[PDB]
UniProtKB/Swiss-Prot annotation, chain A:
Organism: Homo sapiens
Name of the coding gene: TIMELESS
Phosphoserine modified-residue sites: S109
Coiled-coil boundaries: none
Protein name according to UniProt: Protein timeless homolog
Purpose: Plays an important role in the control of DNA replication, maintenance of replication fork stability, maintenance of genome stability throughout normal DNA replication, DNA repair and in the regulation of the circadian clock. Required to stabilize replication forks during DNA replication by forming a complex with TIPIN: this complex regulates DNA replication processes under both normal and stress conditions, stabilizes replication forks and influences both CHEK1 phosphorylation and the intra-S phase checkpoint in response to genotoxic stress.
Tissue: Expressed in all tissues examined including brain, heart, lung, liver, skeletal muscle, kidney, placenta, pancreas, spleen, thymus and testis. Highest levels of expression in placenta, pancreas, thymus and testis.
Assembly description: Monomer. Homodimer or homomultimer. Component of the circadian core oscillator, which includes the CRY proteins, CLOCK or NPAS2, ARTNL/BMAL1 or ARTNL2/BMAL2, CSKN1D and/or CSNK1E, TIMELESS, and the PER proteins. Interacts with PER2. The interaction with PER2 is direct and via its second PAS domain. Interacts directly with PER1 and PER3. Interacts with CRY2, CHEK1, ATR and ATRIP. Interacts with CRY1. Interacts with CLSPN; the interaction is required for leading-strand replication. Interacts (via N-terminus) with TIPIN.
From Swiss-Prot, chain B:
Protein name per Swiss-Prot or TrEMBL: DNA replication licensing factor MCM7
Record-level GO cellular component terms: chromatin; chromosome, telomeric region; CMG complex; MCM complex; membrane; nucleoplasm; nucleus
Main location: nucleus
Placement of covalent cross-link Glycyl lysine isopeptide (Lys-Gly) (interchain with G-Cter in SUMO2): K13, K26
Organism: Homo sapiens (Human)
Residues of the full protein shown: 3 to 240 of 719
Domain of life assignment: Eukaryota
Miscellaneous information on this protein: Early fractionation of eukaryotic MCM proteins yielded a variety of dimeric, trimeric and tetrameric complexes with unclear biological significance. Specifically a MCM467 subcomplex is shown to have in vitro helicase activity which is inhibited by the MCM2 subunit. The MCM2-7 hexamer is the proposed physiological active complex.
């Protein structure tokens, strides 16, 4: 859990292990054991080795690997960076409009005459005039603790693009 | 010691019925004529003179001098209970607190200390000779005293909170907190039944516009 924070296109410990298998040539021995009719007794073992080897990969993404991938992935990384930045800028501008251009201790209170409060009296609004354009009663409410039984299941791992050498080796394998 | 319920009625009788002659022997009720102005908000400070009180009850003067703060509160309560009797005009609202009180009254038609915009003071009796500062000893604690001295330090006029007015964000109700002590605890969460029974979590925002402030000034007197 400490060192699973590796960023994509980097050699994780599993990637380095697969590279060790590749350079040692045990991968070819696994192919031999899988193709051999005489040594069929080790089929379940070889299947488990291959499963743990291809643990992290996605088939279509792996099949798309090839010679010209470095330029493609570099340009894709730059474009995705700009897309993320533009989204964050848009959200920041929307929040800056939702709050006013006055500091938070700048006072002022309003009565929204049509809106009845939880009682019969008219709603008194304190969170600034800017918020009444998109007023909602849950502006200041704390969300609720989902109890342990009702907590939704979460996906067990993030996907990371492994090292390109290991991806090419796994494609060839 | 005395029954303050009866003392309040005695004070009402004095304020209603005392009279003095100012010009050509004509009779005027000097305190009724001022209660009219207080009711109309033409006058704010009422200086009641215990030399006038002495003309028909020296025992009341002794009680006031010996327990002044209690009797100051009693006189203020009596004056507030008397002003509706002397109402005969509509007030021109000039303070923003007048405007707020006007809308408070209309919404109630649709906080006594809050509705109380006047202030009452004892002008001391001449039988009480003026003391020096050194003569204001522990025996005179809680008692009306006249003291001569040199003013040597005066602060700026500051706003002293008298009645803090809050508004709730969830139920839209006003809450009031009279303040007697030199310090007080601000209110955080709404104590209204609508918020409490529903566990609404609505909190209170102080409204200086609706709260009552009074001019306050500290000074130091020094001996001659
Ligand atoms: Zn409330």
């Amino acid at each position: 859990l400490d060192q699973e924070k590796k960023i994509d296109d980097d050699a994780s410990a599993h990637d380095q292990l697969l590279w060790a298998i590749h350079l040692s040539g045990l991968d070819d021995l696994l192919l031999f054991l899988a193709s051999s009719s005489a040594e069929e007794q080790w089929s379940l073992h070889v299947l488990e080795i291959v499963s743990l080897m291809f643990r992290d990969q996605n088939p279509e993404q792996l099949a798309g690997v090839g010679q010209g991938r470095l330029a493609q992935e570099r340009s894709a990384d730059f474009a995705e960076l700009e897309v993320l930045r533009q989204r964050e800028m848009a959200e920041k501008k929307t929040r800056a409009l939702q709050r006013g251009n006055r500091h938070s201790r700048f006072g002022g209170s309003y009565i929204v005459q049509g809106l009845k409060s939880i009682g019969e009296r008219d709603l008194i609004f304190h969170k600034g005039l800017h918020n009444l354009r998109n007023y909602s009663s849950d502006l200041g409410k704390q969300p609720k603790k989902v109890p342990k039984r009702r907590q939704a299941a979460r996906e067990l791992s993030i996907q990371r693009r492994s090292a390109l050498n290991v991806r090419l080796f796994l494609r060839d394998f | 010691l005395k029954d303050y319920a009866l003392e309040k009625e005695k004070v009402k009788k004095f304020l209603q019925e005392f009279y003095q002659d100012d010009e050509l022997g004509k009779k005027q009720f000097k305190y009724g004529n001022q209660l009219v102005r207080l009711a109309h908000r033409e006058q704010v400070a009422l200086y009641v003179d215990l030399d006038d009180v002495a003309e028909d009850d020296p025992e009341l003067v002794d009680s006031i001098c010996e327990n002044a703060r209690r009797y100051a509160k009693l006189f203020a309560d009596a004056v507030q209970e008397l002003l509706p009797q002397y109402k005969e005009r509509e007030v021109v609202n000039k303070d923003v607190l007048d405007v707020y009180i006007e809308h408070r009254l209309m919404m109630e038609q649709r906080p006594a200390e809050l509705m109380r915009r006047f202030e009452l003071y004892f002008q001391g009796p001449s039988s009480n000779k003026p003391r020096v500062i050194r003569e204001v000893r522990a025996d005179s604690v809680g008692k009306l005293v006249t003291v001569r001295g040199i003013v040597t330090r005066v602060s700026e006029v500051k706003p002293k909170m008298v009645v803090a007015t809050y508004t709730c964000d969830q139920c839209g109700a006003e809450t009031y907190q009279p303040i007697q002590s030199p310090t007080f605890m601000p209110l955080i969460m709404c104590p209204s039944q609508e918020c409490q029974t529903n566990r609404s979590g609505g909190r209170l925002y102080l409204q200086t516009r609706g709260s009552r402030f009074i001019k306050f000034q500290e000074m130091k007197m020094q001996e001659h």
